[PDB]
DNA sequence: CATAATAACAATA
DNA sequence: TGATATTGTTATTATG
DNA sequence: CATAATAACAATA
DNA sequence: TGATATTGTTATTATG
């Protein structure tokens, strides 16, 4: 089903890491590599269970969230090396209790958000800053700008986004564009995978599109194009983190620090406040503009983070 | 654990039904009664499985939602008759697939709601009608009135609600009261079971409280007091249905028919529109006023049903 | 003498 | 109703 | 001659 | 991460 095979992505990573001139050892990837190796020729389920047990034991002392992520790394390797039918996929898994608990923690944090939204007092400043970034010659700057003005995920904006003009009857839409290249999504109906769909933008569409074409045409943009999430991460993440931190440090709400995804959160609040037609709920509207699954109203809870000072003002205008 | 016992509630119902002068036969309750009987002395799991299988087979041809409800009836009987440790409780259950599907259907309908809210054009009329009902001498009328002005569930208002004045510093709150007697809730932390808590009212608290005391003091109110859900249902439900239908038929939004629970839905929309402080989301606010569990933001999706014509007007006031 | 580079470690949607 | 893909933070490594 | 009463049947939160 | 409690609709029954 079969009993042999290799998780090639892991191995290439190990081989490249063999001659770095700095950095941590790839101990986790090495464990995975050896685990897949030891599986080769293995046919008894008890053997498989013993091997996984050894693994799980190593992992103890890590955070729950870490452990869960690692189980994903292993399972993705087993699938890579042996396929979808390997009996180890029923064995190498966390128990139901760990996932249940994970979900309890997630949901509690969110409910705390919903109870105490952050007033984003200088949101106009932040949006203008992003707009200013759209005219920068530095493609990282353009990219930040796009995350704020379009609300796409960094990985989307930088590596795989397709933007196009959205028609408005006989003309082109001024406040919205077409987007393709939704991440965190596999093929399935009611999924936006490889689906093109209209989204609002927080500045003139012409600007956004122009700026994106500059991004895609720069040398760095051609390098970024089509990267894996791993490569995108290691190539760009810490720099994007420090850049975004430096850009908004004295305008960002004092409750939190400025993080790239904040632009996506803020985007949704702002677009809802400006564009939501009246027969739609906040949940449904977010989930629409954010490319969430059909009948997925729950992922939208994650994004209710800020309250605009105008809303805060006039809700205070009672008696 | 043990092998003998009786589901007394079922049996009393059968015995009383023995001499009605009208009405359907209690065939379902009789099946349950016989099933519990046949369980007496039964010790082998295969025997138990055979008995449940026979049952499930009878039930086929009913709606999924019906079937699920019936499985609740049976399981509640087993628990009543033999306790929580009886091995039949692991056998008499729907499969995971049925519950999963149930949830898929529920969630799809809700997402359709969220996409197409109903504009409750005459909501002011409806609320005044409820207010007018608060001064009626007929306790069913007072009760309807209370469901609209307080958003409590019919079963709550009629049989077990405790209302009290809510203090406001040194005085009594004018727009809110204290409520105890939350239904659909078992003891557990982060549950409002036997918990008293402040809720908004859509007319002067003094009125609401006065009217409720009249309700509780009428002969019919003393009869309603402390009823089981079954008795409340059979005593009052069809009348409350027809009364509510006749009361609002020409003011209720034409998309649906006037149903008692609509007052609870409308209540939440209206109270949010008038009272929600600005650092709270719609989800968290509903779940608060509706007595939902802590960190329960999902039950609140069910209530997003209507859009107020004022909201609809000024969201239309874009460009 | 100390710090950039890298992956482990971790949280979020 | 089963067990993921992205974003965010920090410890450890090699290096004139 | 037909209809109120009752529980089955069903959906919702 | 297991398998409920309420609200809403209709078929069937007994009955001068
Ligand atoms: C347990 C599990 C969680 N998730 C993610 C999506 C949910 O928003 C989140 C809840 O914790 O976990 C999956 O994508 N697949 C899974 O199997
Ligand atoms: C499956 C299940 C559903 N429910 C209810 C509550 C949820 O809102 C609803 C989802 O379908 O079902 C329970 O209370 N317990 C259960 O075990």
Residue numbers in the entry:
A (entry chain A), B (entry chain A): 103 to 421
What did the paper state?
Hairpin telomeres of bacterial linear chromosomes are generated by a DNA cutting–rejoining enzyme protelomerase. Protelomerase resolves a concatenated dimer of chromosomes as the last step of chromosome replication, converting a palindromic DNA sequence at the junctions between chromosomes into covalently closed hairpins. The protelomerase enzymes function as a dimer, making staggered cleavages of both strands of DNA to form covalent 3′-phosphotyrosine linkages, then exchanging the released 5′-ends while holding onto the 3′-ends, and finally sealing the broken DNA strands to generate two hairpin ends. The TelA monomer consists of two structural domains, the catalytic domain and an α-helical bundle domain, that together clamp down the DNA substrate.
Among these residues, Tyr201 and Arg205 play key roles in refolding the duplex DNA substrate into hairpin products as discussed later. The path of the DNA strand is set by the stacking interaction made by Tyr201 that orients the first base Ade6 and the capping interaction made by Arg205 that shapes the nascent hairpin loop structure. Point mutants TelA•Y201A and TelA•R205A are capable of cleaving DNA to form the phosphotyrosine complex, but they are completely inactive in producing hairpin products in vitro. This underscores the important roles of Tyr201 and Arg205 in refolding DNA into a hairpin telomere.
